[PDB]
Ligand binder design. Structure first.
Ligand code: SF4
Ligand SMILES: [Mg+2]
Ligand SMILES: [Mg+2]
Ligand SMILES: [Mg+2]
Ligand SMILES: [Mg+2]
Ligand SMILES: [Mg+2]
Ligand SMILES: [Mg+2]
Ligand SMILES: [Mg+2]
Ligand SMILES: [Mg+2]
Ligand SMILES: [Mg+2]
Ligand SMILES: [Mg+2]
Ligand SMILES: [Mg+2]
Ligand SMILES: [Mg+2]
Ligand SMILES: [Mg+2]
Ligand SMILES: [Mg+2]
Ligand SMILES: [Mg+2]
Ligand SMILES: [Mg+2]
Ligand SMILES: [Mg+2]
Ligand SMILES: [Mg+2]
Ligand SMILES: [Mg+2]
Ligand SMILES: [Mg+2]
Ligand SMILES: [Mg+2]
Ligand SMILES: [Mg+2]
Ligand SMILES: [Mg+2]
Ligand SMILES: [Mg+2]
Ligand SMILES: [Mg+2]
Ligand SMILES: [Mg+2]
Ligand SMILES: [Mg+2]
Ligand SMILES: [Mg+2]
Ligand SMILES: [Mg+2]
Ligand SMILES: [Mg+2]
Ligand SMILES: [Mg+2]
Ligand SMILES: [Mg+2]
Ligand SMILES: [Mg+2]
Ligand SMILES: [Mg+2]
Lengths: 122, 208, 84, 84
RNA sequence: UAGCGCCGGCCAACUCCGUGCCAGCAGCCGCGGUAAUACGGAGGGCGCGAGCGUUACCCGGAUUCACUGGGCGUAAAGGGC
RNA sequence: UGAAACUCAAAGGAAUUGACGGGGGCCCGCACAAGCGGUGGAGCAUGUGGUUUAAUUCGAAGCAACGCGAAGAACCUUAC
RNA sequence: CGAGGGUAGGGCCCGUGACUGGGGCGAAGUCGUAACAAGGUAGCUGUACCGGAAGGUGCGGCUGGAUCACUUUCU
């Protein structure tokens, strides 16, 4: 465009959106589980991914994925959200963090121990 | 800080000798002279042509593991050299050779750079009359570096200095073997310092 | 949730017997899945087309499927060995 | 014809499926025996009375029996591992 | 005192066994239905080290709001005149 | 004039090879047309589907499976 | 003069919310054949009416239409 147009109009900024609406960019948020459930994924694959509906401190109610094998989640469990979507599961933009709250870690895991919250055995 | 553990995995890994043990590095029981193929049970299998980043990383790790230094100290010295006037690669090598643990190895007080680091860490080395305990001292030109008088019996350094006479020290260094003291005259040059590396690849690596 | 089998389904079930028990265990896995989740779960639940209208099919293998139907408190199984 | 398993009828079947396959083979043979003829065959076909009227019971072992019934061109099976 | 992440490509490091479109991994592309370098351990290797990974946010790469440095027939874009 | 939430790993332009056309032009083969017998009717032989049997061993599936593996099943052959 | 309060009226925002309207992702569900080849009546477009639905038709426009000039579903 002409320089005079840039003088009048100017250039619009991009104004990026927030992928995670966890109350002004808080990294993690304490929440309580309401419904624990297994959910069928999208259709390039098939499994029984563990999903927990969590109502948290900001009054929001959102779903969350539970990584690892097995859990100890109930319909009344204080958990900590992590953030990070999962492709095969629509509506799930978050992750749960195993290791510190009512949600326990992973029993018998030795490779990636810092992830999934498992201590050093022996 | 210092990388501990096995050291022959390194000369075997980069495929070029690094001499990080000293007396054994001239013996026929040398790792490379015995087994030059890399370790880790996949050494006998042929190597696929590495990527450019792989070549840069291998030369960087090669040069870093020559002196046995941490990566955080390495990059800080690199950025100190580049943002300085002069050709960044040679002055980077000059700053790396100006290390205290390096110059005591270059003066031949020790046989290995790690042995040199252990010697300067125990206060067995002094500069201009004052004792120093750290291997990361920036040696300036004209510094009178010596071994402490209180640690002058020291059977190990006596046998090292005993085998030191007859050998020739580098051109930027001078040494009074009987008085057990060296002098750091000038900053080294790439021609004065033969290393099996290509510093330009390191410059290319950190410029990513 | 009573089980209902056909003649060809059972004959093919016996065909699965004495040949390879892994397919048999996969069948039992699908049975308990459908007892828990009839229209969801593993095996990719999918209905059928023009001739087979009113039933459902699950992926046993990459080559074999399972045909079934569910009435209230009833589960009918047919064709455990065929290719659609 | 049609075959029918009850909800409790599969637990003992899976129990025998992971312990001893020979018993399972005798079970399939007696089901084939009932498949060839309704009121006759192996396992001393005898009916039951008032509490289980209309149902019969066959022998697999003397310690375990089979409760069944035949109608609507179908075969109903109640239990296979207990006396009754 | 030594630990942490990773080893399909991007991106450096490979094998066996276990598993069997299950359990699962995953930033993107996408792996898993019996030989899986991707799941889970083991061995081995790579990176860094009293740190190592993750989440969130900012800038970069993004020349993707282009003053340096973009375009408008057919991709979005010439206003009906 | 003119959005957002949510969702996708694409949507799109031109062009190449091929396939397709109830598109065209050109051209073959018992592909039609012209002609001679023939199947499908009947009785029987053989093979197959189905049903039954304890078993009717198994495979083969439109052209290109069905007087096919069988250029030799009374037991043998034979695996039921 | 004046913080503030009250009555009446006007406007705006937030939350809940009976009753609704459409949308987007998933399932080889059902009914169709709209469109891609002259998609089997060439297609597209503005408008108007009609229709379970895609869509049919009228009026006008475009070529981003073809080729030399009965009707026939779906996988
Ligand atoms: S020569 Fe010395 S430093 Fe080199 S591999 Fe052998 S022992 Fe190690
Ligand atoms: Mg410079
Ligand atoms: Mg830079
Ligand atoms: Mg690699
Ligand atoms: Mg992993
Ligand atoms: Mg990420
Ligand atoms: Mg193998
Ligand atoms: Mg395997
Ligand atoms: Mg495979
Ligand atoms: Mg990986
Ligand atoms: Mg693995
Ligand atoms: Mg960025
Ligand atoms: Mg910019
Ligand atoms: Mg510009
Ligand atoms: Mg552009
Ligand atoms: Mg267009
Ligand atoms: Mg356009
Ligand atoms: Mg115009
Ligand atoms: Mg085109
Ligand atoms: Mg062509
Ligand atoms: Mg003919
Ligand atoms: Mg003719
Ligand atoms: Mg004749
Ligand atoms: Mg005739
Ligand atoms: Mg005939
Ligand atoms: Mg015989
Ligand atoms: Mg007032
Ligand atoms: Mg039309
Ligand atoms: Mg019109
Ligand atoms: Mg209407
Ligand atoms: Mg309508
Ligand atoms: Mg009309
Ligand atoms: Mg018209
Ligand atoms: Mg066209
Ligand atoms: Mg014309």
């Amino acid at each position: 465009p002409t320089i005079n147009q840039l003088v009048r109009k100017g250039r619009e900024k991009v104004r990026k959106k927030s992928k995670v609406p966890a109350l002004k960019g808080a990294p993690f948020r304490r929440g309580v589980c309401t419904v624990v459930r297994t959910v069928t994924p999208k259709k390039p694959n098939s499994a029984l991914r563990k999903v927990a509906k969590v109502r948290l401190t900001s009054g929001y109610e959102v779903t969350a994925y539970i990584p690892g094998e097995g859990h100890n989640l109930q319909e009344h469990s204080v958990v900590l959200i992590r953030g990070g979507r999962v492709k095969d599961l629509p509506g799930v933009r978050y992750h749960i963090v195993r290791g510190v709250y009512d949600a326990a870690g992973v029993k018998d895991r030795k490779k990636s121990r810092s992830k999934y919250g498992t201590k050093k055995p022996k | 800080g210092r990388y501990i553990g096995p050291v022959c995995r390194l000369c075997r890994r980069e495929g070029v000798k690094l001499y990080l043990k000293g007396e054994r590095c001239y013996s026929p029981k040398c790792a490379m002279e015995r087994r030059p193929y890399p370790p880790g049970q996949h050494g006998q299998k042929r190597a696929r042509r590495p990527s450019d980043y792989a070549v840069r990383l291998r030369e960087k790790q090669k040069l870093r593991r020559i002196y046995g230094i941490s990566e955080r100290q390495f990059r800080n010295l690199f950025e100190e050299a580049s943002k300085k006037k002069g050709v960044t690669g040679s002055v980077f090598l000059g700053l790396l050779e100006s290390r205290l643990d390096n110059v005591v190895y270059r003066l031949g007080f020790a046989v290995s750079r790690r042995q040199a680091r252990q010697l300067v860490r125990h206060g067995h080395i002094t500069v201009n009359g004052r004792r120093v305990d750290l291997p990361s001292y920036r040696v300036r030109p004209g510094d009178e570096i010596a071994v402490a008088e209180k640690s002058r019996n020291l059977e190990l350094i006596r046998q090292n200095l005993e085998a030191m006479k007859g050998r020739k020290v580098g051109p930027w260094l001078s040494l009074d073997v009987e008085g057990m003291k060296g002098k750091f005259l000038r900053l080294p040059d790439r021609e004065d310092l033969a290393l099996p590396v290509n510093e330009q690849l390191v410059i290319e690596f950190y410029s990513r | 949730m009573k089980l209902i089998w056909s003649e060809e389904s059972w004959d093919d079930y016996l065909y699965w017997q004495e040949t390879d028990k892994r397919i048999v265990k996969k069948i039992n896995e699908l049975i308990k899945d459908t007892r828990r989740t009839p229209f969801e779960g593993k095996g990719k639940p999918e209905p059928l087309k023009h001739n087979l209208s009113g039933f459902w099919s699950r992926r046993i293998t990459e080559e074999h499927r399972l045909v079934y139907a569910v009435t209230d408190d009833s589960l009918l199984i047919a064709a455990c060995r065929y290719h659609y």
